Structure formats: C-alpha cells, structure tokens
Design a protein around this ligand. Structure first.
Ligand SMILES: OC[C@H]1O[C@@H](S[C@@H]2O[C@H](CO)[C@H](O)[C@H](O)[C@H]2O)[C@H](O)[C@@H](O)[C@H]1O
Ligand SMILES: OC[C@H]1O[C@@H](S[C@@H]2O[C@H](CO)[C@H](O)[C@H](O)[C@H]2O)[C@H](O)[C@@H](O)[C@H]1O
Lengths: 134, 134
C-alpha cells in the first residue's frame, strides 16, 4: 500500500504477466504481491538486498485470509540496485512460475489454488515502468 | 469498473501514460478514467461507437466531488472495433493532452487542483494489453 496497486487484473492460467521496473540505487528490499486481494496472496515476492537480517535472498510466502503462510527461500539472486529488472509470472493449478533476469527461474506452490489472479501491488525500492499481459 | 483499476500511479506533470488494448469486435463504447479516485476525475475519456444515442464520437468530461462537469465532444474518431489501439496521456496544471492513433492530438482542461494523477480505471469494450509510464 505505497507503490502501484492494480485490481481486476483477470490473469488466467497460462497467461504471462510481465513487469518492468527500476530498482532504487539504495535498495534494501522490494515487494511484488499477487493474488485475489490484499488479504489473499498466492505470491508475496520479496527480494531482500539487506533487510530483516537477510542479505541478497529472495523470500517467498503466501497470505490466506490475512494470515502469512510458511516462508520459502530461493537459491538465486539475479538483482542489483540501481538497475532495470523484468519479472515474468505465469501460473496453473499447482504452481506459480517466476522467470527472472539472466534466465533464472523458480516455482512456488499455488497454496490458495486460485484460478485467476486479480490483484497486484508493488512496495519498497522498486518503481514500475511497465505492465504487460500476453 | 469490470476492467483494470490502478491506484498510486503517482503520475506527475510532464510524465506520459501509455495504454494499449484491444477494442472488442462488437464494441459499443469504452472508458478511461483518470484522477484521484472514483469520485474525482480530471479526465473521463469515453469513445462511443454506439451508445447514449451517439455514433462514432469521443465524449470527454470531468467529475468533481461526485458531480459531472460540462461535457465536451471531439470531432475525430480514429478507432475501429476489432483492433488494437494505443492512447497516450500527459498532463500539466492547465491541461491534459490526449494523443490518439493516426496522429490526432487534443487538449482537455484540467478542472481539478491535482498535483499528481493517482487513479486510473478502464471499463467497457476495451481489454488492456500494456500500461507504461514514459
Ligand atoms: O514472510 C513474509 C513476511 O516476512 C516478514 S519478516 C519475517 O518475520 C517473521 C516473524 O514474524 C520471521 O522472523 C521471518 O524469518 C521474517 O522473514 C516481513 O515483515 C513481511 O513484510 C513479509 O515479507
Ligand atoms: O458526461 C459524461 C457522462 O455521460 C453520461 S450520458 C450523458 O448524459 C447527460 C445528462 O443526462 C447528457 O444527456 C449527455 O449528452 C450524455 O452524454 C454517461 O452515462 C456517463 O457514464 C458519462 O459518460
């Protein structure tokens, strides 16, 4: 609830969500939130450069009716402060797939078994320049 | 709006909003609303193919504290149903400038006292493919 908020996205399984934005030069962390609304998130995507005692680690979680699920920590960190990052997200019944820069990718389980993604929110040290659906 | 709603846009003067979407093959009309929130719009951009008596007409208005302003009609209609169209909006303290396909450009007076545009809603027979800031 500080960066761009979009609702009625109507993202369907198999469709690709493309997001391009600027990572702040003094970036500590940023957040991409996806799901039904702010209380129901299939993906809380949180690259931490230096925040909460995490350094250069992507933290992923879900939110079910207002309650945070269990955190998953990724093995890769293809982000750098002061640079233009692009993120592509697609999903199906079992998994979200996140494609990062430099050919990196990961899966995160679809814990809420959502069939549409209608909500997206950005927060922290990341400024969206572009959102595309294909 | 059944279509895309965006808030915290933070579109400052001189910055440019680019929207690309598909006009349905049987489009009657579609809507881009820009402003502070649903009640306070510096621009209600409403191309009418066939709606409210009008045929192939662009209808522009504002909304201030819930009340519609004086309506304005443009003379050009560079939209065709069943095709992809891009529209670009930029603003200053005096005017919004709307750039249409096929080169046409018109001004609409900015009737509110807005530092920044924080709210965008799409509606009707227009499906957003891409949204960009500059
Ligand atoms: O799980 C995503 C959210 O994580 C917290 S920070 C989070 O806090 C818990 C205790 O409540 C544990 O210490 C975790 O190890 C730590 O990562 C953030 O404040 C939220 O913004 C989400 O990012
Ligand atoms: O002014 C923008 C809104 O227009 C109305 S329809 C509108 O109705 C007024 C008064 O009732 C006049 O007849 C106008 O000539 C006519 O265009 C729509 O319902 C709104 O959604 C806005 O598009």
């Amino acid at each position: 609830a500080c960066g761009l908020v979009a609702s009625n996205l109507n993202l369907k399984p198999g469709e690709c969500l493309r997001v391009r934005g600027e990572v702040a030069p003094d970036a500590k962390s940023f957040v991409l939130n996806l799901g039904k609304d702010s209380n129901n998130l299939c993906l809380h995507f949180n690259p931490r450069f230096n925040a909460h005692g995490d350094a250069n680690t992507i933290v992923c979680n879900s939110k079910d009716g207002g309650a945070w699920g269990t955190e998953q920590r990724e093995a890769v960190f293809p982000f750098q402060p002061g640079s233009v990052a692009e993120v592509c997200i697609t999903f199906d019944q079992a998994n979200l797939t996140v494609k990062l820069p430099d050919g990196y990718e990961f899966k995160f389980p679809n814990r809420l078994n959502l069939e549409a993604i209608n909500y997206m929110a950005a927060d922290g040290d990341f400024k969206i320049k572009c959102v595309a659906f294909d």
